[PDB]
Design a protein around this ligand. Structure first.
Ligand SMILES: [Cl-]
Ligand SMILES: [Cl-]
Ligand SMILES: [Cl-]
Ligand SMILES: [Cl-]
Ligand SMILES: [Mg+2]
Ligand SMILES: [Mg+2]
Ligand SMILES: [Mg+2]
Ligand code: NA
Ligand code: NA
Length: 326
DNA sequence: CCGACGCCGCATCAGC
DNA sequence: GCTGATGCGGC
DNA sequence: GTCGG
């Protein structure tokens, strides 16, 4: 947090461009800049020093100059005062309300939490669960609670079929002392890129976790991706734990390493790494790494037996999960 | 200057 | 019903 | 908004 003021500034600018301007590349530009500055191991003392980092250019350098000189940014101050922009920014904090729905709601005069509750019939299902648990979803999850949740998921998955392997990813696997949610990668030997030998592989797991009242709501659910809500059990007389977002991703067993690379993140690390892959002539998704031909079409999956193999292909030194928190 | 900016599952909608 | 585009959130 | 070519 050497430069927390600066990176906070860039994040709020990024959120503005995404939520209000719907300018996604500006959002990505600000987030890359914030990320490279949070990496930087000195207290930044000027915008020229910052412009030496990749992703910081002339515009951000000047903003950093204003911020260091005054402690504020007039642009953000103007944005914070505009009622319409502040309202759009707020509604996007509800899960399932993005920039488009937020501006549609505000255009219809729905601008506050109370407005949302009054108009819950204007929400799709995801948005309704996001409003229902609005306050809980803002809370972080201490790693100790993540540890308890991991124990439940892995033991309940083992009860369904001892051949499942569930791996907690996201920030948990990167070693964070708190997480925004719980990310679970699931494999089963009956589900490979070659064949799906058993139906209902994700559903069986989701159903078991609902059965024992760990999973409480569903935001979306398909054959390979579940997004919903869970809650640790509490003791007699004890306040309830907050409800938590849980994501479960069933990945073909022979594609585990690409999957766990993707699900470990961070999001900015994945963008950086996939971008670097393109410059080296490969393309990376959560299933495979493939070479790009001279015409730029993806060739056949390359063999992968470890996360490091993927690093090796694009000529990166290996980075432990704990060092992928960009 | 200028294109290119990571890649994708699910929910929802338009158009047929 | 399907297919294709769009919104959204995932890392 | 930034940047490589
Ligand atoms: Cl943009
Ligand atoms: Cl400010
Ligand atoms: Cl793999
Ligand atoms: Cl693929
Ligand atoms: Mg997470
Ligand atoms: Mg996240
Ligand atoms: Mg998640
Ligand atoms: Na720079
Ligand atoms: Na949202």
């Amino acid at each position: 947090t050497l430069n927390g003021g600066i990176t906070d500034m860039l994040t709020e600018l990024a959120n503005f461009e995404k939520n209000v301007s719907q300018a996604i590349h500006k959002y990505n530009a600000y987030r890359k800049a914030a990320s490279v500055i949070a990496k930087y191991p000195h207290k930044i003392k000027s915008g020229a020093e910052a412009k030496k980092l990749p992703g910081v250019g002339t515009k951000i350098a000047e903003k950093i100059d204003e911020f260091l000189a005054t402690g504020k940014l007039r642009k953000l101050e103007k944005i914070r005062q505009d009622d319409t922009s502040s309202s759009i920014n707020f509604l996007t904090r509800v899960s399932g309300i993005g920039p488009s729905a937020a501006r549609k709601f505000v255009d219809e005069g729905i601008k506050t939490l109370e407005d949302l509750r009054k108009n819950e019939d204007k929400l799709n299902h995801h948005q309704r669960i996001g409003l229902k648990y609005f306050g809980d979803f803002e809370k972080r999850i201490p790693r100790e609670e993540m540890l308890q949740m991991q124990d439940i998921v892995l033991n309940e998955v083992k009860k369904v079929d001892s051949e499942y392997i569930a791996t907690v990813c996201g920030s948990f696997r990167r070693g964070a002392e708190s997480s925004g949610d719980m990310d679970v990668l699931l494999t089963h030997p009956s589900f490979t890129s070659e064949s799906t030998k058993q139906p209902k592989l994700l559903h069986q797991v989701v159903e078991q976790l609902q059965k024992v009242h760990f999973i409480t709501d569903t935001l979306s659910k398909g054959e390979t991706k579940f997004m919903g809500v869970c809650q640790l059990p509490s003791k007699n007389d004890e306040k309830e734990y907050p409800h938590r977002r849980i994501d479960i991703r069933l990945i073909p067993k022979d594609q585990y390493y690409c999957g766990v690379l993707y699900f470990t993140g961070s999001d900015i690390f994945n963008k950086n790494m996939r971008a670097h892959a393109l410059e080296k002539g490969f393309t990376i998704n959560e299933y495979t790494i493939r070479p790009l031909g001279v015409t730029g079409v993806a060739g056949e999956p390359l063999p992968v037996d470890s996360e490091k193999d993927i690093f090796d292909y694009i000529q990166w030194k290996y980075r432990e999960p704990k060092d992928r928190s960009e």
